[PDB]
Amino acid sequence: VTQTMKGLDIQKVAGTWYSLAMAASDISLLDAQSAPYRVYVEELKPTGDLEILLQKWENGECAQKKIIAEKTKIPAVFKIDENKVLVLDTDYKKYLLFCMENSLACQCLVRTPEVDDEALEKFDKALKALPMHIRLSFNPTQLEEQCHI
Amino acid sequence: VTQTMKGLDIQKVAGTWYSLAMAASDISLLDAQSAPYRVYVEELKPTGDLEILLQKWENGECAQKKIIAEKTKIPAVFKIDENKVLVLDTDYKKYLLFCMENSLACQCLVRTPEVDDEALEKFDKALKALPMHIRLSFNPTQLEEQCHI
Ligand SMILES: CCCCCCCCCCCCCCCC(=O)O
Ligand SMILES: CCCCCCCCCCCCCCCC(=O)O
């Protein structure tokens, strides 16, 4: 991944996000509800490390989860306990494109449970470079459900 | 779906095809190997009805399958025993875009086990109109395996 947000102010990504679309390099990273990269972002809490609240389906349950992405020399790049989180683009107010890699998955996050075509076309343009083999998107009804059910 | 091949000569789609990419309106139509619209086209045999040889994963097996799409008043539209098959576009030599609907799934077929970007971008342009929520694509290795394993 060769796209990163110049001048990312991590404080300003704080609060509520919705996983509107997801893509991955391999189908099995996203194909089932229990697929490894099938994580739904709930809330981003910058400490300047980054606390992520996400939902994730495990052994027949939607589980609420709290993880820390440690900051790096680069403001737009964080690490996870192996896995690099890259923030590609964000306008802070409406959307945020990020990828994670050790296997590569990218997401289009939005502030509100709505379908944002402006954001999805930025997401699409940003995956054109990447070797993605699965893409998903969720309707507003699924954005309000635990684990996008 | 509002895109159909003008002047389709069905005889000329005869022979060998590879399911290079697939999209569907609902994730559960494509997400597992046993998902309903997760069918891999092997061979198209026009009689002028259309005989399809496809592969389909059922109860832990890749099953070879033979079905008939009955012709309609419209050359580019066929029916299946409920389900409409629409041929959107084909150059006969390299690629063929088709959709099926009762739930909507579209595929980008190619003559050879290779990744055709020209064809995938035509596929992408053709799904821009459609309310797709899952897309898959397969590498050349998977195109040569039973059920794209
Ligand atoms: C801008 C920051 C975006 C947020 C990035 C979220 C990435 C977190 C995903 C990491 C996967 C860890 C999930 C739990 C581990 C597991 O169940 O195996
Ligand atoms: C240009 C023609 C393209 C070929 C169209 C192929 C569509 C066939 C898919 C129909 C699904 C039927 C599969 C078996 C039925 C089942 O297992 O439920």
Side-chain angles (χ1 to χ4, degrees), chain B residues 39 44 50 52 54 58 65 67 80 85 87 96 98 100:
Chain B
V39 291
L44 291 185
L50 186 69
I52 305 145
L54 56 89
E58 293 176 8
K65 196 144 298 217
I67 66 165
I80 272 170
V85 167
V87 178
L96 183 150
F98 83 88
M100 43 206 160

Side-chain angles (χ1 to χ4, degrees), chain B residues 79-92 94-136:
Chain B
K79 273 186 184 182
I80 272 170
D81 309 333
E82 193 189 308
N83 267 258
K84 197 181 287 155
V85 167
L86 298 98
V87 178
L88 315 196
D89 194 27
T90 191
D91 70 351
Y92 301 109
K94 294 207 193 77
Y95 79 89
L96 183 150
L97 319 184
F98 83 88
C99 293
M100 43 206 160
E101 66 187 33
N102 64 0
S103 290
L104 158 79
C106 311
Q107 293 203 3
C108 174
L109 298 187
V110 297
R111 286 309 202 162
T112 70
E114 306 167 278
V115 181
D116 189 341
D117 298 335
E118 175 209 38
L120 289 178
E121 84 171 15
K122 276 154 162 39
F123 186 56
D124 279 326
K125 285 165 185 160
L127 304 166
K128 211 218 151 135
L130 302 185
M132 299 318 205
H133 289 95
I134 180 157
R135 194 207 178 244
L136 309 169

